[PDB]
Structure 1
Amino acid sequence: ARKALIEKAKRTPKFKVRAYTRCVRCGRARSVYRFFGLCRICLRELAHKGQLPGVRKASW
């Protein structure tokens, strides 16, 4: 159970509750940020690449 799932998440559901976020990049269901469409992993990868506008490593 993967592609059928990265798929069932794209489609509009028989009830509103069944709405769930997947990673727009890797398909990962858990730890998915609303703001990026990304999981915690992918978020890290692009950010390191610079493919995340304004997004930089924080140090305080």
Structure 2
Amino acid sequence: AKKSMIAKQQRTPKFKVQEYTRCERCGRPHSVIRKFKLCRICFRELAYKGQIPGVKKASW
């Protein structure tokens, strides 16, 4: 069950509280960041591949 669940999130449910955040590139909840609307590992991959214009390696 992957594309069915992605499709179910891409629907409009019965109630607004059934709406939950999801991947948009690599299908999974648990740690989809609201800002990027992206999964965590896919954020790490794309931010390594020079995309996602804000994030570089952090040090302070």
CA offsets 1:4-59 (integer angstroms, 9 cap, x no match): 00110011110111001110100111111010111111110010111110211111
- The list of structure 1 runs, each at least 4 consecutive aligned residues, that deviate by more than 4 angstroms after superposition, is none
Residue segments in structure 2 that go unaligned for 5+ positions in a row: none
The alignment yields a C-alpha RMSD, in angstroms, of: 0.8
Give aligned pairs, total.
60
The separation in 2 between residues aligned to 1:9 and 1:41, in whole angstroms, is 19
Paired-residue identity, %:
70
Name whichever structure is richer in helix by fraction.
2
TM-score (norm 1): 0.91
Cross-structure match for 2:56: 56
Residue segments in structure 1 that go unaligned for 5+ positions in a row: none
TM-score (norm 2): 0.91
